[PDB]
């Protein structure tokens, strides 16, 4: 497998580096996250974890 | 006689194209179009029944 990055950091994609419901808390996240980062094969799962976040209102 | 529509009821029948490009069983199944009238009026037969409840 392969993984995502953000600034000084490298980390697995499928949960945010910021606290969950991260787009609702800090909506300008993409303006740090996605300058050249769109090339990552993990970006699809970073996106799913960021927006369809399974936020604290949901359950599994 | 007009009241013969007591004895008989509508039906579903197969239809070639219900709009989205697929065949269905349909309540508006269209049976024959007859166009004998030279003024260009059409008489259409359909699996509904209309003018009665």
């Amino acid at each position: 497998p392969v993984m995502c990055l953000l600034a000084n950091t490298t980390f697995p994609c499928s949960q945010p580096p910021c606290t969950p419901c991260c787009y609702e808390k800090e909506p300008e996240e993409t303006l740090r996250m996605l300058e050249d980062n769109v090339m990552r094969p993990g970006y699809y799962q970073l996106l799913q974890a960021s927006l369809t976040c399974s936020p604290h209102r949901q359950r599994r | 006689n007009f009241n013969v529509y007591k004895a008989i009821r509508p039906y579903l029948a197969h239809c070639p194209d219900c709009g989205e490009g697929h065949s269905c069983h349909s309540p508006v199944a269209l049976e024959r179009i007859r166009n004998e009238a030279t003024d260009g009026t059409l008489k259409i037969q359909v699996s509904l029944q209309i003018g009665i409840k």
């Epitope: 399974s54 936020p55 604290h56 209102r57 949901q58 | 219900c18 709009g19």
Partner: antibody
Framework: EVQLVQSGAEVKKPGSSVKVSCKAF????????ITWVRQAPGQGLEWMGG????????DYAQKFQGRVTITADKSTSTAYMELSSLRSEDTAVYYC????????????????????WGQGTTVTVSS | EIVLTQSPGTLSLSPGERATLSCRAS?????LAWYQQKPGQAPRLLIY???IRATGIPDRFSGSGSGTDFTLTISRLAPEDFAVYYC?????????FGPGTKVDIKR
């Protein structure tokens, strides 16, 4: 996964209204087309001949209303269902807590990327 | 149109290994999905067919289709997998649920 809830079980008599309720939460502040499926005691899943997806019109399948009359509602996260003037055979478990049921052949279409199910609830139409 | 039909009308297996449930109709186009009912209890989602997968839970149960036919498999079915299984495609003049294929854990 979307979190799902219903009103508790009931006991009822024929010829009256039943005001069942469902709530769906985390996303879905407008219902993701959740639908009032129903199963008669111990049978295979012969389903609700009434309500299909709803949140703008009370759309049913091609069967009920003809024997017994049914409708549903579209409030924020909150999907009421009314079944009325019912009879003993309308005793069933009702599973509102269900996926989008995409209506192939007449209007518009729905997603895959998240699962959604949940519990059922019982109305006991009884003597 | 059609009415969905499931190929096993009964099945029975010990704890462990594998199952392969199956369902058919002369068309597909808009997703059917496979649902498991434990006795006395509400269904839950296992699979989507027609072209692409979805699930609620980790990949012990999984499935696929070809042409007219659609399938559901369970891996290491030792747990509470005594259940009846259904699928549906919802739309227009009737299409409806499958009949309910039942499989059990061989006491």
């Amino acid at each position: 996964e979307v979190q799902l809830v219903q009103s508790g079980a009931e006991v009822k008599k024929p010829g009256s209204s039943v005001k069942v309720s469902c709530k769906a939460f985390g996303g879905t502040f407008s219902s993701y087309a959740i639908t009032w499926v129903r199963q008669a005691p111990g049978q295979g899943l012969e389903w609700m001949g009434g309500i299909i997806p709803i949140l703008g019109t009370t759309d049913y399948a091609q069967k009920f209303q003809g024997r017994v009359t049914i409708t549903a509602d579209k409030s924020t996260s909150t999907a009421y269902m009314e079944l009325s003037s019912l009879r003993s055979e309308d005793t069933a478990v009702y599973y509102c807590a269900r996926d989008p049921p995409t209506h192939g052949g007449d209007f518009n279409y729905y997603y895959y990327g998240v699962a959604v199910w949940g519990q059922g609830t019982t109305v006991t139409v009884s003597s | 149109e059609i009415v969905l039909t499931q190929s096993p009308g009964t099945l029975s297996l010990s704890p462990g290994e594998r199952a392969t449930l199956s369902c058919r109709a002369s068309q597909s186009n808009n997703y059917l999905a496979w649902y498991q009912q434990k006795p006395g209890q509400a269904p839950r989602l296992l699979i989507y067919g027609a072209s692409i997968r979805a699930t609620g839970i980790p990949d012990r149960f999984s499935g696929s289709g070809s042409g007219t036919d659609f399938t559901l498999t369970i891996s290491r079915l030792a747990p509470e997998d005594f259940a009846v299984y259904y699928c549906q495609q919802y739309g227009s003049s009737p299409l409806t649920f499958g009949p309910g294929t039942k499989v059990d854990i061989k006491r």
